[PDB]
């Protein structure tokens, strides 16, 4: 028996959609926190349970508001999801790598009462879009302890992150920002071989496809976000022997699928 395990047996169908847990809202203020520039916690209610936490940032001169349906999207799953404003929309990656770590120590130590009763400390875990996909994979390299990370049409000027913490790349086939040829194929390739890592390229979209409802975006993120933060091996059917006609391209070392 999973103690960590939550929710009814997934289908493909269910992942598209906001999931069994009802959501809550808590908006943070700029002026409330220190290290980031507050955001939006969703998190689950209705439920004496305990969840991961997820830390979210969104890119260049965007807003927590970019990741909003995602940032549900995962809590509706059973996740605590802090979705972070910058301290400046300007932020480059790297500074939203330490607003990003910022984030998961004020969801440990310092968030509301009825966020962090339903937090379980020990299971984090890191996602992000562009530039802030570029933060998630820096913080990858920087904390160990998370349990997965997931960036998101990531961008960023270093192309090698040297991290044992399990990736899962969002690549975008036509995205002209962050193009996948330049950022997030040699993101996956460069990983180490030894670190259980995926890339799933989403066919014929755009950089911005992060910022909407994306029926791919929420399984695979669902899928690998419950894998490792929640040890739920019901997932890695979604992850594993793929084949979805949503993708140009699915790439793995296939560590995730025993």
């Known amino acids: 028996?999973?103690?960590?395990?939550?929710?009814?047996?997934?289908?493909?169908?269910?992942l598209t959609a906001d999931g069994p847990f009802s959501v809550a809202t808590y908006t943070v203020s700029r002026l409330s926190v220190s290290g980031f520039g507050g955001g939006v916690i969703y998190y689950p209610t209705g439920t004496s349970l305990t969840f991961g936490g997820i830390a979210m940032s969104p890119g260049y001169t965007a807003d927590a508001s970019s990741l909003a349906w995602l940032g549900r999207r995962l809590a509706s799953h059973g996740f605590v999801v802090l979705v972070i404003n910058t301290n400046s929309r300007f932020d480059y990656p790297d500074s939203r790598a330490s607003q990003l770590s910022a984030a998961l120590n004020?969801?440990?130590?310092?968030?509301?009462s009825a966020v962090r009763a339903r937090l379980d400390a020990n299971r984090l875990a890191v996602a992000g879009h562009a530039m802030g996909g570029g933060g998630t994979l820096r913080i990858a390299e920087q904390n160990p302890s998370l349990?997965?990370?997931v960036p998101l049409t990531p961008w960023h000027t270093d192309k090698t992150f040297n991290t044992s913490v399990p990736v899962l790349i969002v690549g975008a086939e036509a995205d002209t920002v962050a193009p996948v040829s330049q950022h997030a194929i040699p993101f996956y390739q460069n990983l180490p071989s030894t670190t259980p890592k995926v890339y799933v390229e989403l066919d014929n979209a755009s950089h911005f496809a992060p910022n909407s409802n994306n029926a791919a975006i929420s399984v695979y993120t669902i899928s690998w976000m419950?894998?490792?933060?929640?040890?739920?091996?019901?997932?890695?059917?979604?992850?594993?022997?793929?084949?979805?006609?949503?993708?140009?391209?699915?790439?793995?070392?296939?560590?995730h699928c025993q």
């Open 147 to 149: 349990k997965a990370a």
């Open 226 to 255: 419950k894998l490792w933060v929640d040890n739920d091996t019901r997932y890695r059917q979604f992850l594993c022997n793929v084949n979805d006609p949503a993708l140009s391209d699915f790439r793995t070392n296939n560590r």
């Open 1 to 14: 028996s999973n103690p960590y395990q939550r929710g009814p047996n997934p289908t493909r169908s269910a």
């Open 106 to 112: 004020y969801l440990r130590t310092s968030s509301p």
